[PDB]
Enzyme design. Structure first.
Site, PDB file in Angstrom:
ATOM      1  N   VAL A  18       0.838  -1.188   0.000  1.00 49.62           N
ATOM      2  CA  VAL A  18       0.000   0.000   0.000  1.00 49.62           C
ATOM      3  C   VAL A  18       0.890   1.262   0.000  1.00 49.62           C
ATOM      4  CG1 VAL A  18      -1.942  -1.132   1.152  1.00 49.62           C
ATOM      5  CG2 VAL A  18      -0.163  -0.024   2.527  1.00 49.62           C
ATOM      6  N   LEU A  19       2.151   1.107   0.373  1.00 43.99           N
ATOM      7  CA  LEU A  19       3.056   2.260   0.370  1.00 43.99           C
ATOM      8  C   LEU A  19       3.630   2.431  -1.040  1.00 43.99           C
ATOM      9  CD1 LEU A  19       4.740   1.566   3.787  1.00 43.99           C
ATOM     10  CD2 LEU A  19       3.154   3.438   3.278  1.00 43.99           C
ATOM     11  N   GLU A  20       3.039   3.331  -1.830  1.00 41.16           N
ATOM     12  CA  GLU A  20       3.397   3.453  -3.243  1.00 41.16           C
ATOM     13  C   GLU A  20       4.826   3.907  -3.526  1.00 41.16           C
ATOM     14  OE1 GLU A  20       0.270   4.045  -6.191  1.00 41.16           O
ATOM     15  OE2 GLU A  20      -0.535   5.500  -4.733  1.00 41.16           O
ATOM     16  N   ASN A  72       2.153 -12.975  10.433  1.00 44.76           N
ATOM     17  CA  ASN A  72       1.834 -13.580  11.732  1.00 44.76           C
ATOM     18  C   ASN A  72       0.475 -13.191  12.319  1.00 44.76           C
ATOM     19  OD1 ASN A  72       3.846 -15.407  12.663  1.00 44.76           O
ATOM     20  ND2 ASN A  72       5.314 -13.716  12.848  1.00 44.76           N
ATOM     21  N   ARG A  82       3.664  -6.531  12.461  1.00 39.79           N
ATOM     22  CA  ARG A  82       4.611  -7.478  13.036  1.00 39.79           C
ATOM     23  C   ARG A  82       4.593  -7.274  14.530  1.00 39.79           C
ATOM     24  NH1 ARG A  82       9.722  -4.006  10.724  1.00 39.79           N
ATOM     25  NH2 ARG A  82      10.038  -2.509  12.488  1.00 39.79           N
ATOM     26  N   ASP A 132      11.881 -22.298  12.473  1.00 45.83           N
ATOM     27  CA  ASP A 132      12.181 -22.800  13.819  1.00 45.83           C
ATOM     28  C   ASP A 132      13.122 -23.984  13.763  1.00 45.83           C
ATOM     29  OD1 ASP A 132       9.592 -21.646  15.670  1.00 45.83           O
ATOM     30  OD2 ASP A 132       9.250 -21.795  13.545  1.00 45.83           O
ATOM     31  N   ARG A 138       2.832 -13.247  18.858  1.00 47.26           N
ATOM     32  CA  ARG A 138       2.316 -13.303  17.488  1.00 47.26           C
ATOM     33  C   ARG A 138       0.802 -13.428  17.478  1.00 47.26           C
ATOM     34  NH1 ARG A 138       6.837 -16.696  17.983  1.00 47.26           N
ATOM     35  NH2 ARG A 138       8.559 -16.541  16.470  1.00 47.26           N
ATOM     36  N   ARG A 176      16.692 -22.917  12.924  1.00 47.18           N
ATOM     37  CA  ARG A 176      17.269 -22.386  14.181  1.00 47.18           C
ATOM     38  C   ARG A 176      17.690 -23.522  15.096  1.00 47.18           C
ATOM     39  NH1 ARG A 176      12.551 -17.744  14.685  1.00 47.18           N
ATOM     40  NH2 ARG A 176      13.788 -15.965  13.903  1.00 47.18           N
ATOM     41  N   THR A 200      12.789  -9.479  12.613  1.00 52.00           N
ATOM     42  CA  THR A 200      13.709 -10.458  11.987  1.00 52.00           C
ATOM     43  C   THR A 200      13.365 -10.490  10.517  1.00 52.00           C
ATOM     44  OG1 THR A 200      12.428 -12.562  12.020  1.00 52.00           O
ATOM     45  CG2 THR A 200      13.384 -11.875  14.066  1.00 52.00           C
ATOM     46  N   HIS A 225       4.269 -22.090  14.866  1.00 52.46           N
ATOM     47  CA  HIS A 225       5.457 -21.257  14.760  1.00 52.46           C
ATOM     48  C   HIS A 225       5.242 -20.204  15.878  1.00 52.46           C
ATOM     49  CE1 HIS A 225       8.535 -18.570  13.310  1.00 52.46           C
ATOM     50  NE2 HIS A 225       7.639 -17.602  13.202  1.00 52.46           N
ATOM     51  N   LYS A 261       7.483   3.826  -1.460  1.00 54.76           N
ATOM     52  CA  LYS A 261       8.414   2.820  -0.962  1.00 54.76           C
ATOM     53  C   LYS A 261       8.478   1.659  -1.955  1.00 54.76           C
ATOM     54  CE  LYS A 261      10.217   0.319   2.711  1.00 54.76           C
ATOM     55  NZ  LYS A 261      10.539  -1.090   2.421  1.00 54.76           N
TER      56      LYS A 261
HETATM   57  N1  NAI Z   1       6.478 -16.650   9.592  1.00 56.19           N
HETATM   58  C1  NAI Z   1       7.618 -16.180  10.071  1.00 56.19           C
HETATM   59  O1  NAI Z   1       8.626 -16.990  10.458  1.00 56.19           O
HETATM   60  C2  NAI Z   1       7.912 -14.725  10.213  1.00 56.19           C
HETATM   61  C3  NAI Z   1       6.886 -13.836  10.046  1.00 56.19           C
HETATM   62  N2  NAI Z   1       7.067 -12.494  10.193  1.00 56.19           N
HETATM   63  C4  NAI Z   1       5.877 -11.621   9.966  1.00 56.19           C
HETATM   64  O2  NAI Z   1       5.938 -11.055   8.660  1.00 56.19           O
HETATM   65  C5  NAI Z   1       5.155  -9.855   8.624  1.00 56.19           C
HETATM   66  C6  NAI Z   1       6.007  -8.723   8.027  1.00 56.19           C
HETATM   67  O3  NAI Z   1       7.047  -8.330   8.875  1.00 56.19           O
HETATM   68  P1  NAI Z   1       7.999  -7.096   8.472  1.00 56.19           P
HETATM   69  O4  NAI Z   1       8.253  -7.148   7.015  1.00 56.19           O
HETATM   70  O5  NAI Z   1       9.079  -7.020   9.468  1.00 56.19           O
HETATM   71  O6  NAI Z   1       7.024  -5.834   8.739  1.00 56.19           O
HETATM   72  P2  NAI Z   1       7.165  -4.411   7.980  1.00 56.19           P
HETATM   73  O7  NAI Z   1       6.469  -3.399   8.787  1.00 56.19           O
HETATM   74  O8  NAI Z   1       8.637  -4.110   7.718  1.00 56.19           O
HETATM   75  O9  NAI Z   1       6.445  -4.642   6.577  1.00 56.19           O
HETATM   76  C7  NAI Z   1       5.048  -4.760   6.467  1.00 56.19           C
HETATM   77  C8  NAI Z   1       4.677  -4.260   5.075  1.00 56.19           C
HETATM   78  O10 NAI Z   1       3.349  -4.661   4.781  1.00 56.19           O
HETATM   79  C9  NAI Z   1       2.716  -3.590   4.147  1.00 56.19           C
HETATM   80  N3  NAI Z   1       1.277  -3.671   4.289  1.00 56.19           N
HETATM   81  C10 NAI Z   1       0.528  -3.406   5.413  1.00 56.19           C
HETATM   82  N4  NAI Z   1      -0.771  -3.601   5.091  1.00 56.19           N
HETATM   83  C11 NAI Z   1      -0.842  -3.969   3.783  1.00 56.19           C
HETATM   84  C12 NAI Z   1      -1.902  -4.275   2.955  1.00 56.19           C
HETATM   85  N5  NAI Z   1      -3.130  -4.011   3.370  1.00 56.19           N
HETATM   86  N6  NAI Z   1      -1.675  -4.619   1.638  1.00 56.19           N
HETATM   87  C13 NAI Z   1      -0.390  -4.680   1.169  1.00 56.19           C
HETATM   88  N7  NAI Z   1       0.656  -4.372   2.002  1.00 56.19           N
HETATM   89  C14 NAI Z   1       0.434  -4.023   3.276  1.00 56.19           C
HETATM   90  C15 NAI Z   1       3.247  -2.348   4.849  1.00 56.19           C
HETATM   91  O11 NAI Z   1       2.980  -1.156   4.085  1.00 56.19           O
HETATM   92  C16 NAI Z   1       4.717  -2.733   5.029  1.00 56.19           C
HETATM   93  O12 NAI Z   1       5.561  -2.341   3.944  1.00 56.19           O
HETATM   94  C17 NAI Z   1       4.657  -9.597  10.048  1.00 56.19           C
HETATM   95  O13 NAI Z   1       3.327 -10.138  10.157  1.00 56.19           O
HETATM   96  C18 NAI Z   1       5.646 -10.406  10.866  1.00 56.19           C
HETATM   97  O14 NAI Z   1       5.205 -10.765  12.161  1.00 56.19           O
HETATM   98  C19 NAI Z   1       8.325 -12.020  10.482  1.00 56.19           C
HETATM   99  C20 NAI Z   1       9.412 -12.894  10.637  1.00 56.19           C
HETATM  100  C21 NAI Z   1       9.212 -14.286  10.511  1.00 56.19           C
END
Ligand code: NAI
Ligand code: NAI
Ligand code: NAI
Ligand code: NAI
Lengths: 332, 332, 332, 332
Positions: free
Chosen positions: A53-55, A138, A99, A166, A106, A169, A248, A193, A57
């Site tokens: 949604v951040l155009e 998450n 996140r 996991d 989570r 790790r 992370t 997870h 970026k």
């Molecule tokens: N499954 C796993 O092992 C892991 C999962 N995560 C999860 O991944 C997700 C992302 O984490 P990060 O990238 O660090 O967060 P972030 O804040 O850096 O990135 C989130 C992005 O999603 C975008 N976004 C938000 N709503 C949106 C929507 N409606 N449509 C399209 N884009 C949208 C934001 O504009 C932002 O650029 C979180 O839910 C986090 O908890 C993080 C690490 C590991």
């Protein structure tokens, strides 16, 4: 008279291209870009689409990747807030949403992210009705369940990145204790997870030598040195890393690329990822959590039946209960 | 109640992979296996099929490759004298046939090899109606024409390896004179794969600096740098190596894999391979000669227009007449 | 009687690895991690060390990379504010410091960054007396000079990333106009990394064909192909991407990894990086500018002599005077 | 005035190079070239040296490889019958000598190959006294013992390619029965690389699930479907492949490269290779045979202590006896 016109003579009619292996990554934050760079690094996509949604970026990220094209093997990188750019993706990676803030479970992200998913999943399937969706946002197990219900895709096409991370790790920590490469240490972390994950001690081995056989106290309270703490470190790792750098991304990006490689190369490798486990180990509802699954070009085609110890089955069920308790009240 | 039944629980009910990145190598001789191993080394195929009339050798080559599967990323390798095993290949590499004896020209093999191709080409297209064919067997420019005609395929789907190997040799030789990596050396050997190839001196450069401009005597018999001796060496190459070890295979094997990579990765990189040049450089017959061509997922989609000198044009024309002189009497 | 003692029997009595392919990245910001992950992706290091003054962030970056170890080929990753963890590195990449604000020139950071380097450079050489240093921090040409002086290293061991990124961007932009892979596009952006880079039009070609010869108006303000706009775009690049996402990292990260590959693989490939050009093109001061240079295991061992036009020489000279104008007042 | 002199300006003094990762392959027959091409394919050497008594063949092979240099990352490939070309090798691969004729036991090659080794091993160590030697020539276990005694190198530097190959075959066959990638099937073939090899059924597993637990009859005469035959196929495989194509080479070439990768990247991965097992499992003499060993840059640094079943220990000892009976009479 047109650079191209003069320099390049057509042999085939102008005509249609169509990516064989197109991948979409939704969300260009820390996790999204880490998956993107890992996907590009391994030349896994002939076309990479980005959505957020951040155009601004989103455009900047596209351009930065594009500038490194000389060093890559992905002829087309596109980015737009409109899902029409994701059309004909073989794989869509969803990392979009919120996140964890520091120390936040989570499971606390569930409502906000379900709202996000309810809106974007239908757009994704509209444009790629036959894709495989890798859920990463998450809480990942519950969001995979949510994606499955919203998307109307078959089970083997909706996969949670789950405990692939996991387990890597776990294998790293095990490796550090034994002084060998993690690829030579074998051990599975299954279930959520998250905090209720399960260490399958009975399967931990090196070169086929069962560590539990060597140390029957492995995983208990009466252990010399000193496994349980290893599982505890796996459980705590996201929190510790979040406390240090805010989030992370590198390990999960590598983890995601590893899953994609298995599928795009049609390898049928086993990965502990999140799938629908009703009817397994006494689980009675449509719970999603990680078990060792076979991955190839069709997606997640098989689950491995294990001979889990009673305590292992107990912890698994407890993980299933923790999840189902949240799933059961999800509203549509 | 098989072990497989006990250990593995189907998620998506049943296996059967959708035909995808399948490649066939026809001929399992020195060149064919060299192509096979190089294709396997770069994980270019999700299925590799081999075909040869030598049934015993074919089966053994197949088994040996399979025994290496742990170290590779190709889940299925099959082989049969019968062309049904090649069904639905994206790309077919033809290296079968007789080869040059120490001293013997590539054109001395025409008749025997025309008979081989008359059988093989119709089999290839029958089982893979939508493939791209890469012709390696000698005489290569002639056999590329023969394949085009027997195949009924559009020109962008029939590619002769042509001067891809000649140019690789040339860049290696240039690199040896400068002490840098051949990828940092640029120069094009075009036209006929063998004896009569053309060195386009005007394009030989390092970092964009024209070596011809630096040495206007480049290519003449009165050149302190002896560039003509370099081209001569590119020409005598097959011969010297054949005299030493009996055949050549490693370099051509690597070069075929490089063409395949450009195609399966949809890169649109440019390679000096052989295409149908009628209506170019004054050529008025249906003949295949090497020029810088763009390769991608559709095949060989375009050719680079060049400003060639009179003597370069003349050789190209001379090659076209010689080739046509053979091709005009080919029947059926 | 530890598990390790029970499971693992020493053959050669005791572990301790001989310092070998160790790399340090200094600074774990956007660029530093992008370099780290790209170095890790291509298995360039058998040990990766990270250093930063941000202790918390540093530790967390370290842990996150380590968590990905299963998917990598680097057995040891370490990180510390103290430079002892960097001991015996073959190569050190310096990306630490302040960066440009949206709009801000690279030279506005000089003073702050000279202070950073005055501390960091002597630490690097103290712990790795035999390293090769790659300078990435801006202003890059100036800081490359500052590193050379503070380091006491011979010029072949101090390399400024310079115009490696500018040229990558340029080839990407050229590729976009032609519809081919950037590796099939050739053209050199030399001189000063930023605003004042030089496009050497005479070397821009595809398959050896001079585009300038084809379009003698290339580079002027009256060119139907608008080549000058392309160079202008290469120049505005940092700016547009910075305005969009706040910084650039992916492309530079990839480009640094590419330089490292040439070096650790001893390839002698040619890259437009920044070297000490005193006594070239009429330059009479100690200044670092980008030219096509040969990289291998010893470092940057040679530079390509080019025939440059008067206006290209003049810009190079103009850049040298500007750089010198800053460098002459730098103390200690 | 010399191409180089004019075009390339030195930045560093002319001076000494020295390969970091130089590999030598002795013997350029089927096995030697397969190892060579696999080594080159994975960019494992910055310098490749070849040695053989067949001078012409040796030169032709060098030249063919050199012609494919554009596609490789090995700047120096040399070949000579004189061992001075092998100086400063980190790894020497010995594939020189006779191979099995059809149906011939590997043990029958012993005297002829011992004669070969007695003559070449001292030349190898003269020129690379600190190399690691990977023995491949047959019979490989006995020849590793022979190499150790002749070379005077430490145990952890003399390694028999051993059962890395048998185990990959085993994992392939197992994989074929289960429909997954061999990398996801775990199982060890140990003892002699030959007819007396041992299948460690007790360690055969998928995702940590012990197949023997699921089928306690695994490996016996009363097994439903039907393991023992799988081990029999591994044992017979070389003979079957030799009968079909005359020799084997691709799988062993890949196997060898896999070992080299572990060592040159200092990974500490586990491989079943041939080492000195005196004092293990009740073996009383200086027998060499395969056990799971840890490989890194120092060579073979550790052996894995397993909990072998009584029948497994029995078969191991029987393999040790078969070998020792030949070793014991070797004359110096
Ligand atoms: N499954 C796993 O092992 C892991 C999962 N995560 C999860 O991944 C997700 C992302 O984490 P990060 O990238 O660090 O967060 P972030 O804040 O850096 O990135 C989130 C992005 O999603 C975008 N976004 C938000 N709503 C949106 C929507 N409606 N449509 C399209 N884009 C949208 C934001 O504009 C932002 O650029 C979180 O839910 C986090 O908890 C993080 C690490 C590991
Ligand atoms: N275009 C190029 O730059 C190069 C072309 N070549 C050419 O490649 C070809 C193959 O060379 P090698 O592999 O060294 O020869 P080879 O003698 O080792 O193998 C030839 C294979 O063709 C098979 N074959 C013969 N008749 C067949 C048929 N009727 N149907 C199916 N398979 C058949 C033979 O059984 C054998 O397996 C030769 O024609 C040689 O001149 C070789 C090097 C480079
Ligand atoms: N040469 C080129 O083509 C490119 C150069 N850059 C330059 O790279 C540099 C880094 O950029 P980013 O990573 O985006 O900045 P960033 O702000 O994300 O990271 C900078 C890092 O330097 C660290 N740092 C600051 N002072 C330090 C010190 N005193 N000792 C050790 N570490 C210290 C900071 O803690 C931070 O970790 C900037 O100077 C930027 O202008 C950026 C892109 C391309
Ligand atoms: N360990 C393993 O898993 C495997 C081992 N092998 C063994 O590898 C060896 C090589 O097999 P191939 O390459 O098929 O045989 P080959 O006959 O194709 O090659 C043998 C090469 O060794 C050269 N040679 C002979 N004596 C020499 C000496 N005194 N000094 C230097 N070079 C000499 C020959 O001139 C010839 O080029 C055989 O002992 C074979 O049994 C083969 C497959 C697997």
């Amino acid at each position: 008279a047109t650079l191209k016109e003069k320099l390049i003579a057509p042999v085939a009619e102008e005509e249609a291209t169509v990516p064989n292996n197109k991948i979409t990554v939704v969300g260009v934050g820390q996790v999204g870009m880490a998956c993107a760079i890992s996907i590009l690094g391994k030349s896994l996509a002939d076309e990479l689409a980005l959505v957020d949604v951040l155009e601004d970026k989103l455009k900047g990220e596209m351009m930065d990747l594009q500038h490194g094209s000389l060093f890559l093997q992905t002829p087309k990188i596109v980015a737009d807030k409109d899902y029409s750019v994701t059309a004909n993706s073989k794989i869509v990676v969803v990392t979009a949403g919120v996140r964890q803030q520091e120390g936040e479970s989570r499971l606390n992200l569930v409502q906000r992210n379900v709202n996000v998913f309810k809106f974007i999943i239908p757009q994704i399937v509209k444009y790629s009705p036959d894709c495989i969706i890798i859920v990463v946002s998450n809480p990942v197990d519950i969001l995979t369940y949510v994606t499955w219900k919203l998307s109307g895709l078959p089970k083997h096409r909706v996969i949670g990145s789950g405990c692939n991370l996991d387990s890597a790790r776990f294998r790293y920590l095990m490796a550090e204790k034994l002084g060998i490469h993690p690829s030579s240490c074998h051990g599975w972390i299954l279930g959520e997870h998250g905090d209720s994950s399960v260490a399958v001690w009975s399967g931990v081995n090196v070169a086929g030598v069962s560590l539990q056989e060597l140390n029957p106290e492995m995983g208990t309270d009466n252990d010399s040195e000193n496994w349980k703490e290893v599982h505890k470190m796996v459980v705590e790792s996201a929190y510790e890393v979040i406390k240090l750098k805010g989030y992370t991304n590198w390990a999960i990006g590598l983890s995601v690329a590893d899953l994609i490689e298995s599928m795009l190369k049609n390898l049928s490798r086993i990965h502990p990822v999140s799938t629908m486990v009703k009817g397994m180990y006494g689980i009675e509802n449509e719970v999603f959590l990680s078990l060792p699954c076979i991955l190839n070009a069709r997606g997640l085609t098989s689950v491995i039946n294990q001979k889990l110890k009673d305590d292992e089955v107990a912890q698994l069920k407890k993980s299933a209960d923790t999840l189902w308790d949240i799933q059961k009240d999800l509203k549509d």
